[PDB]
Amino acid sequence: TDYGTQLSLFTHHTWIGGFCIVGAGAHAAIFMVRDYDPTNNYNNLLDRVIRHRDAIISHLNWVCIFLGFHSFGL
Amino acid sequence: PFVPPSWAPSVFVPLTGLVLPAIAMATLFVYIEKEAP
């Protein structure tokens, strides 16, 4: 029944979640730059991801363009 | 007089909007990619 509390709580928790997600990506990049060592990641999942990162980024870029067109064009 | 006909917009607007820009775009695009001897 307290609409103010409901709206404020949803908005606040959503913003905290989004900020924490961006921070997660930031620390993933920090690990990749500082703590990553190729001598212990020869043929694991992380090495293969780095190997086909171009394909990953290209497909994600295309799906972003497709979603943008079919979402904003409407 | 100098007054255009009644059908003049129905012919000049599609011309200036589709005929002239397509010809101009194709001509300019061909000109830009011309290789020097």
Binding site: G18, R53, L60, S71 | -
Partner: protein, 74 residues
């Protein structure tokens, strides 16, 4: 219909934020533009105006852009 359109808008914005963050994570060590990005660290402004311009190539700048996209999405 309005709910469908706004849900697709949310999906598109989430995908773009993921694209910026994942691009900054995968291409944090190296890229086709700068092969020794890991030597420059995680947070550096650029690599000079060379190669046409290398402004915002660090992973930190990717986090910086992801912040704007997260703000837009949320």
């Amino acid at each position: 219909t309005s709910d469908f359109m706004v849900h697709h808008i949310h999906a598109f914005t989430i995908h773009v934020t993921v694209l910026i963050l994942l691009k900054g994570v995968l291409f944090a060590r190296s890229s086709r533009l700068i092969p020794d990005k890991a030597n420059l660290g995680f947070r550096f402004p650029c690599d000079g105006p060379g190669r046409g311009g290398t402004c915002q190539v660090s992973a930190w700048d990717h986090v910086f852009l992801g912040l704007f996209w997260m703000y837009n999405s949320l």
